[PDB]
Design a protein around this ligand. Sequence first.
Ligand SMILES: Cc1cn([C@@H]2C[C@H](O)[C@@H](CNC(=S)Nc3ccc(Cl)c(C(F)(F)F)c3)O2)c(=O)[nH]c1=O
Length: 197
Amino acid sequence: DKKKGKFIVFEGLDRSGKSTQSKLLVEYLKNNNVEVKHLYFPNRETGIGQIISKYLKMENSMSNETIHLLFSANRWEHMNEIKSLLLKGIWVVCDRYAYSGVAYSSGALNLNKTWCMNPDQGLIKPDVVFYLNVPPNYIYEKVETQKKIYETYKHFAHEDYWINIDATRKIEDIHNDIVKEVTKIKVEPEEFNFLWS
Ligand SMILES: Cc1cn([C@@H]2C[C@H](O)[C@@H](CNC(=S)Nc3ccc(Cl)c(C(F)(F)F)c3)O2)c(=O)[nH]c1=O
């Protein structure tokens, strides 16, 4: 029944260095003989993710609710896999999750926050979210849009699982900070928890 692996999500704006730091953490975990799967959302695992790619390339004109639900569906299609890995003691490091879903739809597309949160209710909750904080300053690439998304990400800032990381600092120092925070996580197995608990 118990979750044995740890689940770490990285969030942040498009440029914030999510993928660099997530890659570095994976490498650190592996170097230490911790088994780990590196995942990212959205992905192209099935046809759901293929439609999402066409959206982001602005090749289709999909409505805001339709795309929002495809992003959430792409997370749901991964829950079996993520549950099974964590049950086995394999850690999961994931680049973006439901927090992106809410921040981008509610920030960029002006969808109601609660409506945006609902379809991700019940997803596995991560142990920690590292939010790679880079203030936006001078699809979605316009700084005003980035600022809207930045503002909505603040909806999560007060939560205990949410770890703000100043991602303007040196790559090595960011990595050391993330390793420092990972070493604080409880080592013992625990019950699975779920969004938005
Ligand atoms: C997991 C998730 C992510 N996002 C956004 C949209 C996109 O998936 C990501 C922001 N990064 C982007 S838009 N990268 C990007 C930039 C340019 C281009 Cl062309 C592309 C593409 F190749 F995918 F099209 C991708 O975060 C969402 O809006 N909702 C979600 O649920």
